[PDB]
């Protein structure tokens, strides 16, 4: 046993016993540490005990000698099956950046999926379709496919307006003397130019190695 003996859970018991009596027998004990009375009524919590963990999924009934009983189980929700369906039909929906950073954890207080896909605090994303689908598939009794088509079509009409507004917003701005900076199409190409050059220098410097080493392969150093 390389580990050391940690008695952190018994600091009070050990400290209170050492302070009960005095080392100089025949005298009253000195004042104890200042922390002894502070945690007098706050004992440690039980540790190292292995309980039966929460079963997020039904355990296998057919098993007669089940193993891994004290092992935490995987958390799975009915939406996992739905998220995988949507994002597999819309892979480029993963390219839209999404902020999983929490602000105050109070997002689910203003989500009423009986209204539509546009909620308060969260952006219009593939998650909105899954939550809207799940609501229809449970309350309105729709099927997985029917509820999928409905929430899915509502999601498209909203995305179309977002793309149509960028183009129109830029077109009208120039009609009244509005000018903009460089766009990704131009910035993206300039970065390729600067990177293409680096490759050209490497290729030009790397090809000279082969042609030189190739010609020098033969031992023509006699110079007859």
């Amino acid at each position: 046993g390389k580990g050391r003996i940690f008695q952190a859970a018994k600091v009070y018991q050990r400290a209170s016993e050492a302070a009960a009596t005095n080392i100089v027998s025949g005298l009253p004990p000195r004042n104890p540490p200042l922390w002894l009375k502070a945690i007098e009524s706050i004992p440690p919590a039980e540790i190292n005990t292995r309980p039966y963990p929460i079963q997020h999924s039904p355990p296998n009934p057919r098993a007669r000698k089940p193993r891994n009983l004290f092992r935490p189980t995987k958390i799975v929700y009915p939406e996992d099956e739905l998220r995988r369906d949507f994002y597999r039909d819309h892979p480029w929906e993963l390219a839209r950046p999404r902020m999983i950073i929490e602000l105050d954890g109070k997002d689910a207080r203003f989500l009423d999926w009986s209204k539509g896909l546009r909620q308060r605090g969260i952006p219009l994303s593939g998650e909105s379709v899954v939550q809207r689908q799940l609501w229809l598939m449970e309350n309105q009794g729709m099927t997985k496919q029917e509820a999928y088509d409905k929430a899915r079509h509502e999601f498209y009409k909203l995305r179309q307006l977002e793309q149509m507004e960028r183009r129109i917003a830029v077109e009208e701005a120039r009609m009244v003397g509005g000018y903009f900076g460089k766009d990704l199409l131009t910035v993206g190409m300039e970065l390729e130019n600067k990177t293409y050059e680096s490759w050209k220098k490497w290729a030009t410097t790397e090809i000279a190695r082969q042609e030189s080493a190739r010609a020098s392969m033969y031992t023509n150093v006699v110079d007859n």
């Binding site: 190292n48 292995r50 309980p51 039966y52 009983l69």
Partner: peptide
């Protein structure tokens, strides 16, 4: 008897 020793040595709750 030997099983309960091993379950207590392993600090199992059940």
């Amino acid at each position: 008897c030997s099983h309960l020793q091993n379950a207590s040595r392993a600090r199992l709750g059940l």
